[PDB]
Amino acid sequence: ITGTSTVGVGRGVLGDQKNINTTYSTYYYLQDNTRGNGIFTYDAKYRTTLPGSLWADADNQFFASYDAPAVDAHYYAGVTYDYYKNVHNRLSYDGNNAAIRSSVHYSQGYNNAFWNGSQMVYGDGDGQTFIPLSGGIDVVAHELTHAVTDYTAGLIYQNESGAINEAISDIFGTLVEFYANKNPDWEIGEDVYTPGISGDSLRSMSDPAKYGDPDHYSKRYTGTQDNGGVHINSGIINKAAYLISQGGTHYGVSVVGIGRDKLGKIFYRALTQYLTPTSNFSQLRAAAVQSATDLYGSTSQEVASVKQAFDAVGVK
Ligand SMILES: [Ca+2]
Ligand SMILES: [Ca+2]
Ligand SMILES: [Ca+2]
Ligand SMILES: [Ca+2]
Ligand SMILES: [Zn+2]
């Protein structure tokens, strides 16, 4: 809508208070005019029609329980935008400040969130498996990262290319979580998954096998479930990414860690320069090796560690 940029205040899904950029014209809308062509957050009203209604509020205070998923979807979209801009000099998901749209209260007790090719969509969860999924900064950045992928490599959401797609979203979701310095870790969805159980998450990057995901290519899922194991075989790449950043030994292969900033640079370059819609794990290795070479030189520690990380997960 047309109006004036304002700043409201509310509480997120975790009960945390934060300021949010809004727009005033009769109502205060969840519309942040400060980032690119804007960040817009919508109410899906428990339906599956999209986007729903642009979120409108009478007083610019967002403290109702119903407000919470909207506050977080809106806020964390902004943080993710800031990450890509400040860290990778990327202006929104298309690199041209495209408007970012999110819908919350999607369906009834919906235990998921997604990027649908046009916007982000967040369920509220059933209150057992999940609380509203926008409450997770890694979740929001994971979903927004699918948009980045859509506009760059275009990785097909199937088999090895789909597993890389997923891993890319987990990697950058985690890097955004560290960027925000908001209880960061190498797990996915810990802030919104199973409110009855502390310490668990949907996926682990540091140890994918913790939750049954493969941490070596020989252990890859070969069947047809989950689009050919896109959230399963992502474990192999997530493990590689973890090792590149943090180092460690894994299946008797030693990896010297080069840190999060360099992991980000190498995978961002891979994604934007070398990966294609049908890239497989072997091609990701080559893309990451080439990227590290462009950035740090072919005899660098950075290149050596990429090779060792991929060696460790059995990807040649
Ligand atoms: Ca209000
Ligand atoms: Ca965390
Ligand atoms: Ca996390
Ligand atoms: Ca939990
Ligand atoms: Zn995903």
Swiss-Prot record:
Keywords attached to this entry: Calcium, Hydrolase, Metal-binding, Metalloprotease, Protease, Secreted, Signal, Zinc, Zymogen
Temperature characteristics of this protein: Thermostable.
Binding-site residues for Ca(2+) 4, renumbered to this chain: 193-194, 197, 200
Annotated Ca(2+) 3 binding sites: 177, 183, 185, 190
Coiled coil spans: none
Cofactor note (record): Binds 4 Ca(2+) ions per subunit.
Active-site residues, record numbering mapped to chain: 143, 231 (proton donor)
A single Gene Ontology CC term: extracellular region
UniProt protein name: Thermolysin
Gene source species: Bacillus thermoproteolyticus
Classification lineage: Bacteria, Bacillati, Bacillota, Bacilli, Bacillales
Gene that produces this protein: npr
Residues shown, of full length: 233 to 548 of 548
